[PDB]
Ligand binder design. Structure first.
Ligand SMILES: [Ca+2]
Lengths: 60, 178
């Protein structure tokens, strides 16, 4: 949580959505909360990710 | 359960992976695929928490996170006239997971990009000589590149001794060093 983590440009002309790093951190899933787990869009998106073998972690 | 109220991102983004080769006969095109696309903060977190962290990745693999209409290839029209700010981590002592995450947050958060967007995507490369972070820009406009590079330096928490190099895609010496 160094200063850059609160930085974000203000009064953007050509963009609508900007977030500082700490604002994005604040939206991360929290300890012991099922809001993400129970969200059916989130659940389906995670299920659409590749199986573990895809990443070829075994190659080191 | 119920849907969370999502927080939109300014553009959609796609995560790509380059796999390491397992056979002498695999080409680059065989080794790269787009994995998943997203346009909310919450979808981003769910992806990041369910794919391997950087410290898990094998040698000669890459994560690429690019705007959904740009391929992570310099041939792409959006990249071909541009380049990348590059940083190499000589050493495994840095927390590559947090450096990568901070970079991603800065990118999807639109914090270090110019208002008139220059950033097309960002690439994590796992390499024997040392791992690399690359921030891909659409142009070589010097003044916008300097502001992006300085902010990238702050995101990565480098001291003056640590150096970012900008490489125009049309090659291999750097044209700017910070
Ligand atoms: Ca971790």
């Amino acid at each position: 949580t160094d200063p850059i983590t609160n930085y974000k440009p203000m009064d953007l002309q050509y963009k609508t959505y900007a977030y500082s790093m700490n604002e994005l951190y604040h939206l991360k899933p929290s300890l012991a909360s099922a809001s993400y787990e129970e969200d059916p869009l989130i659940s389906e998106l995670v299920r659409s990710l590749p199986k573990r073998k895809f990443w070829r972690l075994r190659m080191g | 359960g119920p849907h969370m109220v999502k927080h939109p991102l300014n553009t959609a983004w796609t995560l790509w992976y380059t796999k390491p080769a397992v056979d002498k006969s695999e080409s680059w095109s065989d080794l790269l695929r787009p994995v998943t696309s997203f346009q909310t903060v919450e979808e981003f977190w769910a992806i990041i928490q369910n794919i391997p962290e950087p410290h898990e990745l094998p040698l000669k693999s890459d994560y690429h996170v690019f705007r959904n209409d740009v391929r992570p290839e310099w041939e792409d029209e959006a990249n071909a006239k541009g380049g990348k700010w590059s940083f190499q981590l000589r050493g495994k002592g840095a927390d590559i997971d947090e450096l990568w995450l901070r970079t991603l947050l800065a990118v999807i958060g639109e914090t270090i990009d110019e208002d008139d967007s220059q950033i097309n995507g960002v690439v994590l490369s796992i390499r024997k000589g040392g791992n690399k972070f690359a921030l891909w820009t659409a142009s070589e406009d010097k003044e916008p590149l300097l502001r992006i590079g300085g902010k990238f330096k702050q995101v990565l928490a480098l001291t003056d001794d640590g150096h970012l190099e900008f490489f125009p895609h049309s090659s291999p010496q750097p044209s700017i060093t910070l």
